[PDB]
Design a protein around this nucleic acid. Structure first.
Lengths: 136, 96, 147, 177, 49, 324
RNA sequence: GACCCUGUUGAGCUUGACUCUAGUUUGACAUUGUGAAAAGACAUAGGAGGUGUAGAAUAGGUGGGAGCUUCGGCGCCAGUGAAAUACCACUACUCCUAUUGUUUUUUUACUUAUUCAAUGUGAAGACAUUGUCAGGUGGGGAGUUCCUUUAGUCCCUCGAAAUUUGAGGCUAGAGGAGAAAAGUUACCACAGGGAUAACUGGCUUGUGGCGGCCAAGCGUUCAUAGCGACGUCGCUGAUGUCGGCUCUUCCUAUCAUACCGAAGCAGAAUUCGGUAAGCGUUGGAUUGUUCACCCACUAAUAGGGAGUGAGCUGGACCGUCGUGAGACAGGUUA
């Protein structure tokens, strides 16, 4: 059931991932003073929603995600993946010269293959997120 | 209601009394802040009614429909402690 | 008619959810406080605050209809027209107020696409139609224009 | 349109005394000399200026619809019921005040009673069944109602418990559109 | 008075107000001159007396 | 040829032969094609801030937090906002239910802006059915004075009554009178505002029914009622008041027989009335001579509005001053 | 549970006569003068005027029309435009100058109008107050018991309009004991009364409904009082107290294994259908649940039953105070 997921379904958000991000923001405040936000794996209607609320509205919100999630309005959401260099250049053309102040990534691999294959695929996707974060 | 009237009374009172009243209104801004900040901002002035100076009730003067302009006449008052009083008071108006 | 529609395109919360929110503000209730209307309905606007006398009658969103298959007796065509209002349910007067669609119920449909030229050269925009099927049993509304 | 009688004005002011404090402020002459009066039109009480009510005489009885601010209606049994159109008058001199959060304001506007988890601020020393006016956290008046328990009694409440029965909320304006 | 846009940190029309406006325009200034000419009218009459 | 262009517009857009002849006549052919494009495009939705309850940026900042995209509608109005996107419905907002704003049209702002209702006056609104005009009169009047708002229908008077109570107006008298009946029954008003019923040619996107259902008979019936409606506005207003005694004639029509001939009729049936400057920032001057029907040369002060010049419905504001 | 009714209540609709009038309110006038500064409408003598579109052009408009002629510039035939230009007859207004003038109003000035106070004149001031008409409303006071629709005459007035309209009239049907209260509702809340005292059992399955056309027949005699099939034409991610486990036996509505028929079925792999229950018929991930999808193993990972299957596992009565609304370490009970 999850109490935070039930709170989202009642009034809060689309999912409980938004509650995770405001807990990170409460732990350390970085979304209040930044200007550019780039999410490498956009959670559906939850992570972009709390990014829309705390941050200044409509200020370079990049929503690249390999999963074809619903496009959140007032958030520039892309349905293409992140590991390819062509998608990196597409990200470059959309940010012009403004590099990302805060970079976010949601690691959601196909868990279930004896917890070792899933852990490496999670870790490989996390290192690929670090490559684009170190780039921008 | 009292903030407007104390500003009015500070105009026509002796030098030591006017300096004391500006000290009192200085404490109100620091303590209450957002409650009386709209009085000095003329764009946040209410339009529900008009300001009644000569009123027999605190509630019926409609104090939020007026603007405070006695600071124009009191940055020019001969005693500079009165002048220093405003510059301290307007300092916490900008500090809100 | 479809071609003009294609050219033109080229150019809140539910009553069920509202009843759940209000129930949190209450306590041990009378058994069967809500009266779910089983019969298919037409409501019109998206969000309205009903009178207290009609607030128990919940019409669920999955049981609503906005368009009807309406046949013209003289032109011998059937077109899908939007429903404007429910005018007369000949079974229950409360069903008229709640908007229940029943066999024999008069509804008002938009005839703007049909291009009916009335007297004095005016294009008709709202006409009476009698529901000639049982929308409880089939998932559609079928009507014949009273022209 | 007629003014109230002795029996009608006792009932009207009894309902206003449950919710407000300075009732003599309402019946008080202002700077121009005119007063606020009470008028009855089609079993409905209107709180209007006397100068307005004097120049509304020329409207025919069947042809007059509203006058100033409507307080409520007097029912067939003789009781007087307050409506949400009286809320700006009630909020001006509210005796007891309750503030609800953003998660409690939206249920109140749908028609729910205030729950303990919805309250953001109470008023100290409130009796059990007293007339309270409901605000949000931005000091926006939302409606009025009757408290369920005392403030001391409701501080110990289980947070699904009722702390104020709803009587009128400003979602009634959506009803008449 | 009702048009000026005084702010705690923006005072432009407040400083100007009625800078390009004469001494005599106000009804105080209009009527006080009437006694000022009446004062010299009185000063001439006692001087003549 | 023009007759070929006449038949093409009648078939492509679904216009009647009578109405499209009229609309093609008043614009040049480049200006005409822009007008017919703007008619099928919905106007932007706008919001009027209630001065009696709040001011604009505090309302604007509040609706930012609920998920609404706003931008003020130009420099001409210090009050209106424009809505682009919104998650929360605008009519279900707690600020809306508290009386902080009313959904209106941008063209509705102009007649109350052209008139200048001041404090402690007695005003009349001769067609006040939705209530956007009257609540704007009271906001400028700071809930002082008297406003006589009337309707000719009971049904649309109920929505007006609710808007008055929601916005907290408290200085209005709602009556159910014909506009012609009014000077006999009350009279003596400092200001009168006339939003006369008309063809609705300025509002096509909101009302697509008038695209075809307007004939030559309809354009004899409506200007005749409006001519009697405008003469009633003159007799209601007093010539000599302590403040200004002014009259505003307003309509949402584009057709010349509905706005410019009626103001010429009033200037020829009452010599004691004069046309004055509207005070509106933007607009286009009224037509002086149309098709062999010369008007008074003072009609140039009158302003017109079009949905292709600006995102504002087809409108017409005429402001009058009474002398004797 | 649900259905019907009664009482109280709420929400809503309707009725609550007519004539004067207190009150309240709108317009016009009068008291009431004498000066100063302005404005407007009436009075002239003049001067100057007209840019929606298109048309070469900035077309007040009307009637003649076809050179008086310093120009044959300019008219005529040509467009374009509701309207066409050379030339002389007309008033309809708009912007300015001046005097040979009438009235109405605004601002201001002074007291004779007016008001207040006193006895055996002081103060205010051309504003109030007051008076007369024409109206509006009148749930208050005193007396008695108007409009809408319908059908006809095309019989008569006011307003608008480039020749067509809107608003009323005539005839006689229908709509709207009297401020005490009354009438009314498949609506709501509470309390009560009535009826029924759970349901289904040769049940269910693969092919929608409406409307038109066709239609063998039948019918009250029969292709028409009408009923009327097959066709054809026209319109059209769910979810979430739900799941998991359970031996044996049976059904076939067969996933596999066996055998047939058909398919561009070349071979390989198959697809669709038939006879078949002899023999077999897993596990992950998937917000927590079921799945639907997606993955691996496998010959294959079929669905069901043991009259509304069967087992283990993850409340209703009174009493008190209220009621625009609930509460009670109050009582009792299966």
């Amino acid at each position: 059931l999850d109490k935070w997921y039930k709170l989202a379904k009642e009034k809060g958000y689309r999912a409980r991932a938004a509650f995770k991000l405001i807990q990170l923001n409460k732990k350390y405040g970085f979304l209040e003073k930044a200007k550019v936000v780039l999410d490498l794996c956009a959670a559906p209607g939850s992570w972009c929603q709390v990014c829309a609320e705390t941050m200044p509205k409509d200020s370079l919100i990049i929503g690249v995600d390999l999963a074809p999630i619903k496009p959140i309005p007032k958030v520039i959401t892309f349905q293409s993946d992140i590991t390819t260099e062509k998608c990196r250049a597409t990200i470059r053309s959309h940010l012009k010269t403004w590099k990302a102040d805060v970079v976010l990534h949601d690691g959601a691999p196909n868990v279930g293959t004896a917890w070792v294959q899933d852990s490496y695929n999670q870790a490989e996707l996390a290192l690929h997120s670090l490559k684009l974060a170190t780039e921008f | 209601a009292f903030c407007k009237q104390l500003m009015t009374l500070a105009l026509q009172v002796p030098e030591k009394s006017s300096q004391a009243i500006l000290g009192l209104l200085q404490d109100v801004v620091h303590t209450h802040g957002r409650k009386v900040a709209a009085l000095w901002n003329t764009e946040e002035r209410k339009g529900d009614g008009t300001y009644k100076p000569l009123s027999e009730t605190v509630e019926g003067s409609n104090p939020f429909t007026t603007t405070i302009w006695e600071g124009e006449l009191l940055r020019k008052h001969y005693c500079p402690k009165v002048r220093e009083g405003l510059k301290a008071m307007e300092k916490e108006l900008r500090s809100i | 008619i479809k071609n003009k529609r294609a050219e033109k395109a080229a150019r809140g919360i539910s009553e069920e959810e509202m009843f759940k929110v209000v129930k949190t503000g209450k306590k041990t209730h009378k058994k069967g406080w809500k009266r779910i209307v089983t019969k298919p309905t037409f409501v019109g606007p998206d969000f309205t605050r009903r009178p207290v006398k009609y607030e128990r009658f919940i019409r669920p969103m999955g049981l609503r209809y906005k368009k009807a298959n309406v046949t013209h007796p003289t032109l011998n065509v059937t077109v899908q027209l939007p429903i404007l209002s429910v005018k007369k349910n000949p079974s229950n007067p409360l069903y008229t107020q709640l908007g229940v669609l029943t066999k024999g119920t008069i509804i008002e449909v938009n005839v703007s696409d049909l291009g009916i030229v009335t007297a004095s050269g005016k294009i008709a925009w709202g006409r009476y139609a009698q529901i000639t099927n049982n929308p409880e049993n089939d998932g559609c509304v079928n009507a014949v224009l009273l022209v | 349109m007629r003014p109230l009688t002795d029996q009608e004005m006792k009932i009207v002011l009894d309902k206003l005394a449950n919710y407000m404090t300075d009732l003599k402020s309402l019946i008080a002459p202002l700077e121009d000399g005119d007063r606020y009066v009470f008028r009855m039109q089609k079993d409905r009480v209107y709180y209007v200026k006397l100068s307005i009510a004097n120049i509304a005489t020329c409207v025919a009885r069947d042809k007059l619809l509203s006058l100033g601010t409507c307080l409520g209606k007097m029912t067939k049994s003789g009781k007087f019921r307050l409506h949400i159109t009286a809320l700006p008058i009630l909020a001006q001199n509210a005796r007891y005040k309750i503030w609800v959060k953003d998660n409690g304001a939206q249920p109140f506007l749908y028609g729910s009673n205030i729950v303990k988890a919805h309250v953001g601020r109470w008023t100290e020393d409130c009796p059990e069944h007293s007339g309270c006016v409901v605000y949000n956290m931005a000091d926006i008046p939302l409606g009025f109602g009757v408290t369920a328990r005392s403030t001391a009694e409701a501080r110990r409440l289980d947070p699904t418990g009722i702390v104020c029965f709803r009587q009128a909320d400003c979602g009634e304006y959506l009803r008449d559109e | 008075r009702a048009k000026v846009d005084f702010a705690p940190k923006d005072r432009a029309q407040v400083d100007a107000f009625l800078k390009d406006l004469e001494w005599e325009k106000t009804p105080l200034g209009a009527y006080v001159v009437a006694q000022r000419k009446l004062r010299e009218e009185r000063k001439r009459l006692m001087e003549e007396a | 040829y023009t007759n070929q262009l006449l038949k093409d517009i009648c078939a492509y857009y679904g216009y009647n032969e009578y109405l499209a002849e009229k609309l093609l006549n008043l614009f040049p052919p480049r200006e005409a094609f822009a007008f017919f494009e703007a008619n099928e495009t919905p106007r932007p939705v706008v919001i009027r801030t209630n001065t009696l309850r709040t001011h604009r940026r505090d309302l604007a900042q509040a609706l930012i937090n609920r998920g609404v995209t706003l931008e003020p509608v130009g420099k001409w109005s210090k009050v209106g906002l424009q809505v682009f996107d919104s998650k929360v419905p605008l009519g279900a907002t707690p600020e809306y239910l508290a009386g902080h704003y009313i959904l209106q049209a941008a063209s509705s702002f102009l007649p109350v802006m052209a008139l200048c209702p001041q404090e402690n006056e007695r005003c009349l609104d001769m067609a006040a059915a939705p209530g956007g005009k009257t609540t704007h009169m009271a906001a400028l009047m700071k809930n002082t004075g008297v406003i006589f708002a009337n309707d000719p229908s009971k049904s649309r008077a109920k929505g007006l009554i609710g808007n008055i109570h929601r916005l907290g107006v408290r200085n209005t008298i709602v009556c159910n009178y014909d506009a012609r009946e009014f000077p006999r029954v009350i009279g003596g008003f400092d200001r009168v505002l006339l939003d006369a019923p008309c063809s609705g040619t300025g509002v096509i996107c909101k009302d697509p029914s008038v695209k075809t259902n307007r004939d030559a008979k309809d354009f004899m019936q409506l200007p005749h009622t409006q001519k009697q409606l405008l003469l009633a506005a003159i007799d209601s207003c007093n010539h000599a008041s302590k403040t200004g005694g002014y009259i505003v004639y307003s309509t949402c029509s584009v057709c010349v027989e509905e706005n410019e001939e009626v103001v010429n009729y009033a200037l020829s049936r009452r010599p004691n009335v004069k046309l004055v400057e509207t005070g509106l920032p933007f607009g286009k001057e009224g037509f002086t001579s149309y098709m062999g029907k010369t008007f008074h040369p003072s009609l140039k002060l009158t302003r017109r509005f079009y949905p292709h010049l600006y995102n504002v419905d087809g409108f017409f504001v005429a402001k009058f001053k009474k002398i004797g």
